[PDB]
Each structure stands twice: as structure tokens, then as C-alpha cells.
Amino acid sequence: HHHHHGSELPQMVQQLNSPDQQELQSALRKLSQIASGGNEQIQAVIDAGALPALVQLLSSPNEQILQEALWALSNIASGGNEQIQAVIDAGALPALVQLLSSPNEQILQEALWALSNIASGGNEQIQAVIDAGALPALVQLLSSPNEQILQEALWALSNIASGGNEQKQAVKEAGAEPALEQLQSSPNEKIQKEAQEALEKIQ
């Protein structure tokens, strides 16, 4: 069931620019929720012009606003290829890549999730993730002592690796092979499986 009507979206979008922080968060949450409900609903959020404002919030020093903005963007990017494309065209990628070097694990997790959603699209979507410079960051993350970070980084890398030959080649050129060859021997069963599958995708 629809919780919100289409004629309420414009108001929510305007409120992503409120100086009132509880108004802002409230609107962030509603857009997240609507965007969680399938392609038709995601499209309504995009058509209402929510993307530009969501991307602005990605540089926020307020982790509460940041987490909800990332989550909303992840939900939008979980739709169709053209919906993922809209996220890319709105300039989300530089901000997401920047967040890959965050000392905050919770932020890291949501930026990686947004990125792997984006990288689930077509070769065009994947190439934009590569072009934005995700690969050097993702590779550096592969030598983290934190298994949860590893799993998250592998999901993104594995998705990029599901692209065409150009995309697989970029993965090889960013030096991912030796790291994936190591993690293929991981005692963590989830990491081992993802690493193996990613390695096999890039031959």
C-alpha cells in the first residue's frame, strides 16, 4: 500500500533544504521510505527532483543526515538501469568515492552499499563507477583487518567485475588480482566465497 500521495512529493523535496533540522530529517525519512517501494515509486521520487538535493547532503558533517541521505540514494539506485543512471547524472559518485576513505565504519558501509547498487546496473553504469575512481579505494580496502568492511568492499568489486571486458580489465589494472587471490584463502566463509567469485569473473 502507498503511504504517501504523489502531490506530497514536491513539499518533501523543498524541505530537503529546510534550515529546520527536524523538518529536513522527516523529509529524508519519507523519501527513503517511498524509494524502498519499487521502480514506480523510485521514479516518482526522481521526477519530483529529489536527486540534486540528496547529493548536496552527501557532503554533510552531520552523520544523521548523511546516513539517511545515503540510504535514500541506495534505494533509488536499487531500481532500474535508468534510475541508477539518474543517480550518476546527478553527480552522486565523487561524494560516494570520497566517503570510501572515512574512518567511520557505519558511513563506509552505507557508501559501499550505494556503490554496489549502482554497480549492479549495465556496463555504462559500471564504467561511471570506475571513471569516478572507485577501484583504487576498493582495492586499498581489501587489505583491511576488518572482515565486515571486506565483505562490503567485495560486494561492490564483485558487481563491477560482472561487467563487460572493459570493466573486468579496469579491475585487473587497478591491481585487484593479487588481493583477491589472497582472500580466496580466507578462513571467513563469506569473504572466501565472494573473493573467489570476483576473481573468476576477471579470469
JSON list of C-alpha atoms in Angstrom, two decimals:
[
{"chain": "A", "resi": 1, "resn": "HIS", "atom": "CA", "xyz": [0.00, 0.00, 0.00]},
{"chain": "A", "resi": 2, "resn": "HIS", "atom": "CA", "xyz": [1.05, 3.62, -0.73]},
{"chain": "A", "resi": 3, "resn": "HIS", "atom": "CA", "xyz": [1.64, 5.57, 2.48]},
{"chain": "A", "resi": 4, "resn": "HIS", "atom": "CA", "xyz": [2.09, 8.90, 0.62]},
{"chain": "A", "resi": 5, "resn": "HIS", "atom": "CA", "xyz": [0.39, 10.53, -2.39]},
{"chain": "A", "resi": 6, "resn": "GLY", "atom": "CA", "xyz": [2.26, 11.91, -5.45]},
{"chain": "A", "resi": 7, "resn": "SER", "atom": "CA", "xyz": [1.19, 15.51, -4.73]},
{"chain": "A", "resi": 8, "resn": "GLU", "atom": "CA", "xyz": [3.10, 15.44, -1.41]},
{"chain": "A", "resi": 9, "resn": "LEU", "atom": "CA", "xyz": [6.50, 14.75, -3.02]},
{"chain": "A", "resi": 10, "resn": "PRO", "atom": "CA", "xyz": [7.21, 18.37, -4.10]},
{"chain": "A", "resi": 11, "resn": "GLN", "atom": "CA", "xyz": [6.82, 19.56, -0.50]},
{"chain": "A", "resi": 12, "resn": "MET", "atom": "CA", "xyz": [9.24, 16.88, 0.78]},
{"chain": "A", "resi": 13, "resn": "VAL", "atom": "CA", "xyz": [11.82, 17.90, -1.85]},
{"chain": "A", "resi": 14, "resn": "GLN", "atom": "CA", "xyz": [11.60, 21.57, -0.82]},
{"chain": "A", "resi": 15, "resn": "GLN", "atom": "CA", "xyz": [12.09, 20.53, 2.83]},
{"chain": "A", "resi": 16, "resn": "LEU", "atom": "CA", "xyz": [15.41, 18.84, 2.00]},
{"chain": "A", "resi": 17, "resn": "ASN", "atom": "CA", "xyz": [16.53, 22.46, 2.01]},
{"chain": "A", "resi": 18, "resn": "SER", "atom": "CA", "xyz": [14.97, 23.50, 5.33]},
{"chain": "A", "resi": 19, "resn": "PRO", "atom": "CA", "xyz": [17.10, 25.23, 7.96]},
{"chain": "A", "resi": 20, "resn": "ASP", "atom": "CA", "xyz": [14.90, 23.30, 10.42]},
{"chain": "A", "resi": 21, "resn": "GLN", "atom": "CA", "xyz": [16.79, 20.05, 11.01]},
{"chain": "A", "resi": 22, "resn": "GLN", "atom": "CA", "xyz": [13.82, 18.01, 12.20]},
{"chain": "A", "resi": 23, "resn": "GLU", "atom": "CA", "xyz": [11.83, 19.06, 9.11]},
{"chain": "A", "resi": 24, "resn": "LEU", "atom": "CA", "xyz": [14.81, 18.03, 6.96]},
{"chain": "A", "resi": 25, "resn": "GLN", "atom": "CA", "xyz": [15.23, 14.61, 8.64]},
{"chain": "A", "resi": 26, "resn": "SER", "atom": "CA", "xyz": [11.49, 13.96, 8.48]},
{"chain": "A", "resi": 27, "resn": "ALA", "atom": "CA", "xyz": [11.53, 14.62, 4.71]},
{"chain": "A", "resi": 28, "resn": "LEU", "atom": "CA", "xyz": [14.68, 12.50, 4.30]},
{"chain": "A", "resi": 29, "resn": "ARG", "atom": "CA", "xyz": [12.95, 9.59, 6.00]},
{"chain": "A", "resi": 30, "resn": "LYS", "atom": "CA", "xyz": [9.77, 9.80, 3.91]},
{"chain": "A", "resi": 31, "resn": "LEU", "atom": "CA", "xyz": [11.75, 9.85, 0.65]},
{"chain": "A", "resi": 32, "resn": "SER", "atom": "CA", "xyz": [13.80, 6.86, 1.84]},
{"chain": "A", "resi": 33, "resn": "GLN", "atom": "CA", "xyz": [10.59, 5.01, 2.64]},
{"chain": "A", "resi": 34, "resn": "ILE", "atom": "CA", "xyz": [8.86, 5.79, -0.67]},
{"chain": "A", "resi": 35, "resn": "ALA", "atom": "CA", "xyz": [12.04, 4.88, -2.59]},
{"chain": "A", "resi": 36, "resn": "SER", "atom": "CA", "xyz": [12.01, 1.49, -0.83]},
{"chain": "A", "resi": 37, "resn": "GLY", "atom": "CA", "xyz": [8.81, 0.51, -2.64]},
{"chain": "A", "resi": 38, "resn": "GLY", "atom": "CA", "xyz": [9.76, -0.44, -6.20]},
{"chain": "A", "resi": 39, "resn": "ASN", "atom": "CA", "xyz": [10.51, 1.17, -9.56]},
{"chain": "A", "resi": 40, "resn": "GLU", "atom": "CA", "xyz": [7.25, 3.12, -9.95]},
{"chain": "A", "resi": 41, "resn": "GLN", "atom": "CA", "xyz": [7.81, 4.79, -6.57]},
{"chain": "A", "resi": 42, "resn": "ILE", "atom": "CA", "xyz": [11.53, 5.39, -7.18]},
{"chain": "A", "resi": 43, "resn": "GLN", "atom": "CA", "xyz": [10.57, 7.11, -10.44]},
{"chain": "A", "resi": 44, "resn": "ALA", "atom": "CA", "xyz": [8.15, 9.39, -8.61]},
{"chain": "A", "resi": 45, "resn": "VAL", "atom": "CA", "xyz": [10.97, 10.47, -6.27]},
{"chain": "A", "resi": 46, "resn": "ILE", "atom": "CA", "xyz": [13.28, 11.16, -9.27]},
{"chain": "A", "resi": 47, "resn": "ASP", "atom": "CA", "xyz": [10.57, 13.05, -11.22]},
{"chain": "A", "resi": 48, "resn": "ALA", "atom": "CA", "xyz": [9.92, 15.21, -8.14]},
{"chain": "A", "resi": 49, "resn": "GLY", "atom": "CA", "xyz": [13.58, 16.36, -8.38]},
{"chain": "A", "resi": 50, "resn": "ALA", "atom": "CA", "xyz": [14.89, 14.86, -5.14]},
{"chain": "A", "resi": 51, "resn": "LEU", "atom": "CA", "xyz": [18.28, 13.76, -6.52]},
{"chain": "A", "resi": 52, "resn": "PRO", "atom": "CA", "xyz": [20.13, 17.12, -6.69]},
{"chain": "A", "resi": 53, "resn": "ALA", "atom": "CA", "xyz": [19.20, 17.89, -3.06]},
{"chain": "A", "resi": 54, "resn": "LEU", "atom": "CA", "xyz": [20.13, 14.37, -1.86]},
{"chain": "A", "resi": 55, "resn": "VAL", "atom": "CA", "xyz": [23.57, 14.70, -3.47]},
{"chain": "A", "resi": 56, "resn": "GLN", "atom": "CA", "xyz": [24.18, 18.07, -1.71]},
{"chain": "A", "resi": 57, "resn": "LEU", "atom": "CA", "xyz": [23.64, 16.36, 1.63]},
{"chain": "A", "resi": 58, "resn": "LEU", "atom": "CA", "xyz": [26.35, 13.80, 0.88]},
{"chain": "A", "resi": 59, "resn": "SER", "atom": "CA", "xyz": [28.96, 16.36, 1.98]},
{"chain": "A", "resi": 60, "resn": "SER", "atom": "CA", "xyz": [27.15, 16.95, 5.30]},
{"chain": "A", "resi": 61, "resn": "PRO", "atom": "CA", "xyz": [29.17, 16.80, 8.57]},
{"chain": "A", "resi": 62, "resn": "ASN", "atom": "CA", "xyz": [26.01, 15.67, 10.37]},
{"chain": "A", "resi": 63, "resn": "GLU", "atom": "CA", "xyz": [26.16, 11.84, 10.36]},
{"chain": "A", "resi": 64, "resn": "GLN", "atom": "CA", "xyz": [22.41, 11.51, 10.99]},
{"chain": "A", "resi": 65, "resn": "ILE", "atom": "CA", "xyz": [21.56, 13.48, 7.83]},
{"chain": "A", "resi": 66, "resn": "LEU", "atom": "CA", "xyz": [24.38, 11.72, 5.97]},
{"chain": "A", "resi": 67, "resn": "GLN", "atom": "CA", "xyz": [23.20, 8.18, 6.80]},
{"chain": "A", "resi": 68, "resn": "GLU", "atom": "CA", "xyz": [19.59, 8.84, 5.75]},
{"chain": "A", "resi": 69, "resn": "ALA", "atom": "CA", "xyz": [20.71, 10.63, 2.54]},
{"chain": "A", "resi": 70, "resn": "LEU", "atom": "CA", "xyz": [22.94, 7.66, 1.64]},
{"chain": "A", "resi": 71, "resn": "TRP", "atom": "CA", "xyz": [20.13, 5.20, 2.45]},
{"chain": "A", "resi": 72, "resn": "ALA", "atom": "CA", "xyz": [17.67, 7.14, 0.25]},
{"chain": "A", "resi": 73, "resn": "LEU", "atom": "CA", "xyz": [20.22, 7.13, -2.57]},
{"chain": "A", "resi": 74, "resn": "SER", "atom": "CA", "xyz": [20.86, 3.40, -2.14]},
{"chain": "A", "resi": 75, "resn": "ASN", "atom": "CA", "xyz": [17.10, 2.76, -2.50]},
{"chain": "A", "resi": 76, "resn": "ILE", "atom": "CA", "xyz": [16.87, 4.84, -5.68]},
{"chain": "A", "resi": 77, "resn": "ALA", "atom": "CA", "xyz": [19.93, 3.02, -7.06]},
{"chain": "A", "resi": 78, "resn": "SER", "atom": "CA", "xyz": [18.27, -0.34, -6.33]},
{"chain": "A", "resi": 79, "resn": "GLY", "atom": "CA", "xyz": [15.80, 0.27, -9.20]},
{"chain": "A", "resi": 80, "resn": "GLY", "atom": "CA", "xyz": [16.17, 0.14, -13.00]},
{"chain": "A", "resi": 81, "resn": "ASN", "atom": "CA", "xyz": [19.29, 0.98, -15.03]},
{"chain": "A", "resi": 82, "resn": "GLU", "atom": "CA", "xyz": [17.84, 4.37, -15.99]},
{"chain": "A", "resi": 83, "resn": "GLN", "atom": "CA", "xyz": [17.15, 5.10, -12.33]},
{"chain": "A", "resi": 84, "resn": "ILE", "atom": "CA", "xyz": [20.74, 4.19, -11.43]},
{"chain": "A", "resi": 85, "resn": "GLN", "atom": "CA", "xyz": [21.74, 6.43, -14.35]},
{"chain": "A", "resi": 86, "resn": "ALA", "atom": "CA", "xyz": [19.79, 9.34, -12.89]},
{"chain": "A", "resi": 87, "resn": "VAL", "atom": "CA", "xyz": [21.78, 8.95, -9.66]},
{"chain": "A", "resi": 88, "resn": "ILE", "atom": "CA", "xyz": [25.04, 9.05, -11.66]},
{"chain": "A", "resi": 89, "resn": "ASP", "atom": "CA", "xyz": [23.92, 12.08, -13.74]},
{"chain": "A", "resi": 90, "resn": "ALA", "atom": "CA", "xyz": [23.06, 13.94, -10.53]},
{"chain": "A", "resi": 91, "resn": "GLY", "atom": "CA", "xyz": [26.74, 13.62, -9.53]},
{"chain": "A", "resi": 92, "resn": "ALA", "atom": "CA", "xyz": [26.50, 11.24, -6.57]},
{"chain": "A", "resi": 93, "resn": "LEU", "atom": "CA", "xyz": [29.69, 9.34, -7.45]},
{"chain": "A", "resi": 94, "resn": "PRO", "atom": "CA", "xyz": [32.50, 11.76, -6.39]},
{"chain": "A", "resi": 95, "resn": "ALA", "atom": "CA", "xyz": [30.87, 12.13, -2.96]},
{"chain": "A", "resi": 96, "resn": "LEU", "atom": "CA", "xyz": [30.44, 8.36, -2.59]},
{"chain": "A", "resi": 97, "resn": "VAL", "atom": "CA", "xyz": [34.04, 7.66, -3.56]},
{"chain": "A", "resi": 98, "resn": "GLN", "atom": "CA", "xyz": [35.23, 10.32, -1.10]},
{"chain": "A", "resi": 99, "resn": "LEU", "atom": "CA", "xyz": [33.31, 8.52, 1.67]},
{"chain": "A", "resi": 100, "resn": "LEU", "atom": "CA", "xyz": [35.24, 5.30, 0.94]},
{"chain": "A", "resi": 101, "resn": "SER", "atom": "CA", "xyz": [38.13, 6.77, 2.92]},
{"chain": "A", "resi": 102, "resn": "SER", "atom": "CA", "xyz": [36.02, 7.55, 6.01]},
{"chain": "A", "resi": 103, "resn": "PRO", "atom": "CA", "xyz": [37.29, 6.43, 9.44]},
{"chain": "A", "resi": 104, "resn": "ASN", "atom": "CA", "xyz": [33.59, 5.95, 10.30]},
{"chain": "A", "resi": 105, "resn": "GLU", "atom": "CA", "xyz": [32.66, 2.28, 9.59]},
{"chain": "A", "resi": 106, "resn": "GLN", "atom": "CA", "xyz": [28.89, 2.96, 9.55]},
{"chain": "A", "resi": 107, "resn": "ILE", "atom": "CA", "xyz": [29.27, 5.65, 6.86]},
{"chain": "A", "resi": 108, "resn": "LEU", "atom": "CA", "xyz": [31.69, 3.37, 4.98]},
{"chain": "A", "resi": 109, "resn": "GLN", "atom": "CA", "xyz": [29.11, 0.57, 4.97]},
{"chain": "A", "resi": 110, "resn": "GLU", "atom": "CA", "xyz": [26.35, 2.73, 3.51]},
{"chain": "A", "resi": 111, "resn": "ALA", "atom": "CA", "xyz": [28.57, 4.36, 0.86]},
{"chain": "A", "resi": 112, "resn": "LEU", "atom": "CA", "xyz": [29.76, 0.89, -0.26]},
{"chain": "A", "resi": 113, "resn": "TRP", "atom": "CA", "xyz": [26.16, -0.35, -0.37]},
{"chain": "A", "resi": 114, "resn": "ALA", "atom": "CA", "xyz": [25.12, 2.62, -2.51]},
{"chain": "A", "resi": 115, "resn": "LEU", "atom": "CA", "xyz": [28.08, 1.96, -4.80]},
{"chain": "A", "resi": 116, "resn": "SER", "atom": "CA", "xyz": [27.35, -1.78, -5.19]},
{"chain": "A", "resi": 117, "resn": "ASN", "atom": "CA", "xyz": [23.73, -0.96, -6.00]},
{"chain": "A", "resi": 118, "resn": "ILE", "atom": "CA", "xyz": [24.95, 1.43, -8.68]},
{"chain": "A", "resi": 119, "resn": "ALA", "atom": "CA", "xyz": [27.40, -1.20, -9.95]},
{"chain": "A", "resi": 120, "resn": "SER", "atom": "CA", "xyz": [24.52, -3.73, -10.30]},
{"chain": "A", "resi": 121, "resn": "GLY", "atom": "CA", "xyz": [23.40, -1.85, -13.45]},
{"chain": "A", "resi": 122, "resn": "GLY", "atom": "CA", "xyz": [24.56, -2.12, -17.05]},
{"chain": "A", "resi": 123, "resn": "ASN", "atom": "CA", "xyz": [28.11, -1.70, -18.33]},
{"chain": "A", "resi": 124, "resn": "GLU", "atom": "CA", "xyz": [27.52, 2.06, -18.72]},
{"chain": "A", "resi": 125, "resn": "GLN", "atom": "CA", "xyz": [26.64, 2.42, -15.06]},
{"chain": "A", "resi": 126, "resn": "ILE", "atom": "CA", "xyz": [29.63, 0.30, -14.03]},
{"chain": "A", "resi": 127, "resn": "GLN", "atom": "CA", "xyz": [32.05, 2.31, -16.18]},
{"chain": "A", "resi": 128, "resn": "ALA", "atom": "CA", "xyz": [30.97, 5.53, -14.48]},
{"chain": "A", "resi": 129, "resn": "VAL", "atom": "CA", "xyz": [31.76, 3.99, -11.08]},
{"chain": "A", "resi": 130, "resn": "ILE", "atom": "CA", "xyz": [35.22, 3.09, -12.45]},
{"chain": "A", "resi": 131, "resn": "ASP", "atom": "CA", "xyz": [35.70, 6.52, -14.07]},
{"chain": "A", "resi": 132, "resn": "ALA", "atom": "CA", "xyz": [34.94, 8.22, -10.74]},
{"chain": "A", "resi": 133, "resn": "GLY", "atom": "CA", "xyz": [37.94, 6.33, -9.28]},
{"chain": "A", "resi": 134, "resn": "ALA", "atom": "CA", "xyz": [36.25, 3.73, -7.07]},
{"chain": "A", "resi": 135, "resn": "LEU", "atom": "CA", "xyz": [38.75, 0.97, -7.89]},
{"chain": "A", "resi": 136, "resn": "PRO", "atom": "CA", "xyz": [41.90, 2.26, -6.13]},
{"chain": "A", "resi": 137, "resn": "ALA", "atom": "CA", "xyz": [39.81, 2.88, -2.98]},
{"chain": "A", "resi": 138, "resn": "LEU", "atom": "CA", "xyz": [38.07, -0.53, -3.14]},
{"chain": "A", "resi": 139, "resn": "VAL", "atom": "CA", "xyz": [41.43, -2.29, -3.64]},
{"chain": "A", "resi": 140, "resn": "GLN", "atom": "CA", "xyz": [43.01, -0.47, -0.65]},
{"chain": "A", "resi": 141, "resn": "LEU", "atom": "CA", "xyz": [40.02, -1.63, 1.45]},
{"chain": "A", "resi": 142, "resn": "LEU", "atom": "CA", "xyz": [40.81, -5.28, 0.54]},
{"chain": "A", "resi": 143, "resn": "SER", "atom": "CA", "xyz": [43.73, -5.30, 2.96]},
{"chain": "A", "resi": 144, "resn": "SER", "atom": "CA", "xyz": [41.60, -4.09, 5.90]},
{"chain": "A", "resi": 145, "resn": "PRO", "atom": "CA", "xyz": [41.79, -6.18, 9.09]},
{"chain": "A", "resi": 146, "resn": "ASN", "atom": "CA", "xyz": [38.01, -5.69, 9.41]},
{"chain": "A", "resi": 147, "resn": "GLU", "atom": "CA", "xyz": [36.11, -8.64, 7.89]},
{"chain": "A", "resi": 148, "resn": "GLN", "atom": "CA", "xyz": [32.82, -6.68, 7.72]},
{"chain": "A", "resi": 149, "resn": "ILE", "atom": "CA", "xyz": [34.47, -3.94, 5.63]},
{"chain": "A", "resi": 150, "resn": "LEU", "atom": "CA", "xyz": [36.00, -6.69, 3.44]},
{"chain": "A", "resi": 151, "resn": "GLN", "atom": "CA", "xyz": [32.56, -8.22, 2.77]},
{"chain": "A", "resi": 152, "resn": "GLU", "atom": "CA", "xyz": [31.13, -4.81, 1.85]},
{"chain": "A", "resi": 153, "resn": "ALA", "atom": "CA", "xyz": [34.05, -3.91, -0.45]},
{"chain": "A", "resi": 154, "resn": "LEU", "atom": "CA", "xyz": [33.89, -7.34, -2.13]},
{"chain": "A", "resi": 155, "resn": "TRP", "atom": "CA", "xyz": [30.17, -6.92, -2.94]},
{"chain": "A", "resi": 156, "resn": "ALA", "atom": "CA", "xyz": [30.98, -3.71, -4.82]},
{"chain": "A", "resi": 157, "resn": "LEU", "atom": "CA", "xyz": [34.08, -5.12, -6.55]},
{"chain": "A", "resi": 158, "resn": "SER", "atom": "CA", "xyz": [32.27, -8.33, -7.49]},
{"chain": "A", "resi": 159, "resn": "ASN", "atom": "CA", "xyz": [29.48, -6.28, -9.11]},
{"chain": "A", "resi": 160, "resn": "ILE", "atom": "CA", "xyz": [31.95, -4.17, -11.09]},
{"chain": "A", "resi": 161, "resn": "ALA", "atom": "CA", "xyz": [33.58, -7.46, -12.17]},
{"chain": "A", "resi": 162, "resn": "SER", "atom": "CA", "xyz": [30.17, -8.61, -13.51]},
{"chain": "A", "resi": 163, "resn": "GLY", "atom": "CA", "xyz": [30.52, -6.03, -16.30]},
{"chain": "A", "resi": 164, "resn": "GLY", "atom": "CA", "xyz": [31.94, -6.43, -19.81]},
{"chain": "A", "resi": 165, "resn": "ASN", "atom": "CA", "xyz": [35.57, -6.91, -20.83]},
{"chain": "A", "resi": 166, "resn": "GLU", "atom": "CA", "xyz": [36.50, -3.22, -20.49]},
{"chain": "A", "resi": 167, "resn": "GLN", "atom": "CA", "xyz": [35.20, -3.30, -16.91]},
{"chain": "A", "resi": 168, "resn": "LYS", "atom": "CA", "xyz": [37.00, -6.56, -15.98]},
{"chain": "A", "resi": 169, "resn": "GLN", "atom": "CA", "xyz": [40.21, -5.15, -17.46]},
{"chain": "A", "resi": 170, "resn": "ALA", "atom": "CA", "xyz": [39.99, -2.00, -15.33]},
{"chain": "A", "resi": 171, "resn": "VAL", "atom": "CA", "xyz": [39.70, -4.24, -12.24]},
{"chain": "A", "resi": 172, "resn": "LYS", "atom": "CA", "xyz": [42.88, -6.08, -13.30]},
{"chain": "A", "resi": 173, "resn": "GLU", "atom": "CA", "xyz": [44.66, -2.75, -13.98]},
{"chain": "A", "resi": 174, "resn": "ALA", "atom": "CA", "xyz": [43.79, -1.34, -10.56]},
{"chain": "A", "resi": 175, "resn": "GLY", "atom": "CA", "xyz": [45.78, -4.29, -9.14]},
{"chain": "A", "resi": 176, "resn": "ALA", "atom": "CA", "xyz": [42.88, -6.25, -7.64]},
{"chain": "A", "resi": 177, "resn": "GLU", "atom": "CA", "xyz": [44.05, -9.77, -8.64]},
{"chain": "A", "resi": 178, "resn": "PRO", "atom": "CA", "xyz": [46.77, -10.37, -6.01]},
{"chain": "A", "resi": 179, "resn": "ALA", "atom": "CA", "xyz": [44.43, -9.21, -3.23]},
{"chain": "A", "resi": 180, "resn": "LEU", "atom": "CA", "xyz": [41.56, -11.40, -4.46]},
{"chain": "A", "resi": 181, "resn": "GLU", "atom": "CA", "xyz": [43.98, -14.34, -4.74]},
{"chain": "A", "resi": 182, "resn": "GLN", "atom": "CA", "xyz": [44.79, -13.87, -1.03]},
{"chain": "A", "resi": 183, "resn": "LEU", "atom": "CA", "xyz": [41.16, -13.53, 0.16]},
{"chain": "A", "resi": 184, "resn": "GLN", "atom": "CA", "xyz": [40.31, -16.66, -1.85]},
{"chain": "A", "resi": 185, "resn": "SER", "atom": "CA", "xyz": [42.04, -18.44, 1.06]},
{"chain": "A", "resi": 186, "resn": "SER", "atom": "CA", "xyz": [40.15, -16.52, 3.80]},
{"chain": "A", "resi": 187, "resn": "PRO", "atom": "CA", "xyz": [39.01, -18.55, 6.88]},
{"chain": "A", "resi": 188, "resn": "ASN", "atom": "CA", "xyz": [35.85, -16.41, 6.82]},
{"chain": "A", "resi": 189, "resn": "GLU", "atom": "CA", "xyz": [33.49, -18.37, 4.58]},
{"chain": "A", "resi": 190, "resn": "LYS", "atom": "CA", "xyz": [31.60, -15.34, 3.27]},
{"chain": "A", "resi": 191, "resn": "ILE", "atom": "CA", "xyz": [34.77, -13.46, 2.31]},
{"chain": "A", "resi": 192, "resn": "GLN", "atom": "CA", "xyz": [36.26, -16.60, 0.72]},
{"chain": "A", "resi": 193, "resn": "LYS", "atom": "CA", "xyz": [33.19, -17.15, -1.46]},
{"chain": "A", "resi": 194, "resn": "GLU", "atom": "CA", "xyz": [32.88, -13.53, -2.65]},
{"chain": "A", "resi": 195, "resn": "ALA", "atom": "CA", "xyz": [36.61, -13.25, -3.36]},
{"chain": "A", "resi": 196, "resn": "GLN", "atom": "CA", "xyz": [36.65, -16.50, -5.33]},
{"chain": "A", "resi": 197, "resn": "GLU", "atom": "CA", "xyz": [33.64, -15.42, -7.42]},
{"chain": "A", "resi": 198, "resn": "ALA", "atom": "CA", "xyz": [35.12, -11.97, -8.08]},
{"chain": "A", "resi": 199, "resn": "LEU", "atom": "CA", "xyz": [38.47, -13.48, -9.12]},
{"chain": "A", "resi": 200, "resn": "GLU", "atom": "CA", "xyz": [36.79, -15.92, -11.51]},
{"chain": "A", "resi": 201, "resn": "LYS", "atom": "CA", "xyz": [34.80, -13.11, -13.15]},
{"chain": "A", "resi": 202, "resn": "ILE", "atom": "CA", "xyz": [38.07, -11.32, -14.06]},
{"chain": "A", "resi": 203, "resn": "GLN", "atom": "CA", "xyz": [39.75, -14.63, -15.11]}
]
